[PDB]
Design a protein around this ligand. Structure first.
Ligand SMILES: NC(=O)c1ccc[n+]([C@@H]2O[C@H](COP(=O)([O-])OP(=O)(O)OC[C@H]3O[C@@H](n4cnc5c(N)ncnc54)[C@H](O)[C@@H]3O)[C@@H](O)[C@H]2O)c1
Lengths: 320, 313
């Protein structure tokens, strides 16, 4: 019976993922083709004119579902009453930065935003972090809410890694990607991610059977986009963000799990608690559940050591 | 089989916004697979490979295949829909005649390629400017092998802008507004018209100048021309053409002017209010106020005739 537009925040909204993402949300791809939406667009204060330009183009689309757009540089305004927050706002890695430098630069963003979400968002707000380093930014956000944000409602996006893996597997097998499911991206959204096809299927057939460098191609793909395009991914990252949220809210298809960076307390794999860690997940009634049994014993667990160690190092680098 | 859809100018920003909408099903609906054939100039081939790579990385269930090329015959081979975003780049201080001549070279080659290898019922919309005249060049270049009712130019971005503006002026949701009309050329001589528009079921200073000036306002704010909203409009144009317009709704389309009910001259691509059914437009009659109404169109008619001559047609 609720008729109000659902309030959705997008941070980094003056950036290139934002540009690709906002028309998808406004057209109904996120919440459904008959669900009214209100967009709250956050970027930095020097980007306000740019944000006005995004708002103007959204107006010029004449989207029937787009009830209202707010543009702002104040997270307290952006997050006011929001149900969904897609966090693309993060400054770009500069030449000469180590991973630690990128973490330290973007950490402040997520401390400030976690505090704001806690202060003004809806109690049931669901967050996905896209901006890098994604898993650790998500952890920072959650910890900065001082217990006021449900830990099961803060996630990080590995869905672009996941979709890349689904597509690569489809290409290697010579089948339509629509038939391929249940690849897994374990761990960090970084070069330590563990792309895993051991449980993947084509229809219901184990993928290994339909195939007459996989890990390296998945890990290398973002760099390949930069080589070809001169810029990092945007279209495909927006698409993945929509997928991540859509599966979370509307549910995963029957027999299907998807990769999500989720809070690791009480996971069934023995991975250390207190991290945002990518696991295979089903979603139902707005909630993720980690699918158990998809690592091959202690051998399987040993496969995760490097990514666990990286995430623990990042957590320390974040002051957490 | 998948419907083969060509997009020219596919390495540009409209193309970047447009291709994921097509691939996700927005163009032809939720159960129609598509094959994307992406054309741009040969120096843009690496950029097109990046577009293809990102399309792959979307894992779109409806996207059966992607081909990238700089050869128009390759891009248009078997295609049923062609969305022409590529056009000659304008340069500050270029004469209109020169610009039209340079676009005529592009659109002549593309019309010849469409006639040579596209599907017999291929439908075309031209987005890239000058859109009406480029469309006309394409049609005329097709050696009589292309149905004149299947070549169009896009005024839908101007239309959607006018819907939005009227909604904002009335203080109502845009979903409640319909039947604005953009007559004529996709240019500063367009005639934005709210005389037939409806808010709900009720008949509806600066409206015209705001619509005409909106593209420049985007550039002032953005630093670049519209892209997201132009891609959205292109999808609307084609989707409404193929799927049909809802009962009581008409939309603006640049269409071939022979046999129009408004006495506008023949042999032009001219924006009119249209209903669509099953891949065919029909111009809606009676929406100008007699001869005084028809005089509203004189300037845009003259501009289109001037451009046709300067293009070498
Ligand atoms: N799979 C993934 O998780 C994935 C994929 C692609 C990109 N990324 C990351 O997503 C982020 C966005 O990528 P992009 O290409 O759109 O970058 P971009 O530089 O085009 O956009 C980032 C935007 O964030 C804004 N920003 C900076 N601080 C902010 C703050 N305090 N609040 C809100 N906005 C702020 C910037 O001003 C900028 O407009 C980057 O960190 C990028 O590395 C992640």
């Amino acid at each position: 019976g609720s008729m109000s537009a659902v309030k959705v925040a997008v941070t980094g909204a003056a950036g290139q993922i934002g540009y690709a993402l906002v028309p998808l949300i406004a057209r109904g791809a996120l919440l459904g083709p008959t669900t009214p939406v209100e967009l709250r667009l956050l970027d930095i204060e020097p980007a306000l004119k740019a944000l006005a330009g995004v708002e103007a183009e959204l107006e010029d689309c004449a989207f029937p579902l787009l009830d209202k757009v707010v543009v702002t540089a104040d997270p307290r305004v952006a997050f006011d009453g929001v149900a969904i927050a897609i966090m693309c706002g993060a400054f770009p890695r500069k030449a000469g930065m180590e991973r630690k430098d990128l973490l330290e630069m973007n950490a402040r963003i997520f401390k400030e935003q976690g505090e704001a979400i806690a202060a003004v968002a809806a109690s049931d707000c669901r967050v996905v972090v896209v901006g890098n380093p994604a898993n650790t930014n998500a952890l920072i956000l959650l910890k900065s809410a001082q217990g006021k944000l449900n830990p099961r409602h803060v996630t990080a996006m590995t869905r672009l890694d996941h979709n890349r893996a689904l597509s690569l597997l489809a290409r290697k097998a010579g089948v339509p990607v629509s038939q391929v499911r249940n690849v897994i991206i374990w761990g960090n959204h970084s070069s330590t991610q563990v792309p895993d096809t051991d449980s993947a299927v084509i229809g219901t057939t184990p993928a290994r059977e339909a195939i007459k460098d996989f890990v390296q191609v998945v890990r290398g793909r973002g760099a390949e986009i930069i080589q070809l395009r001169g810029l990092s991914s945007a279209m495909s990252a927006a698409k993945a963000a929509v997928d991540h949220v859509h599966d979370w809210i509307h549910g995963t298809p029957e027999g299907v799990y998807v990769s999500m960076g989720v809070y690791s307390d009480e996971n069934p794999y023995g991975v250390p608690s207190g991290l945002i860690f990518s696991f295979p997940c089903t979603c139902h009634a707005g909630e993720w559940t980690v699918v158990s049994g998809k690592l091959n014993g202690d051998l399987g667990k040993q496969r995760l050591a490097s990514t666990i160690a990286e995430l623990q190092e990042e957590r320390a680098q974040a002051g957490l």
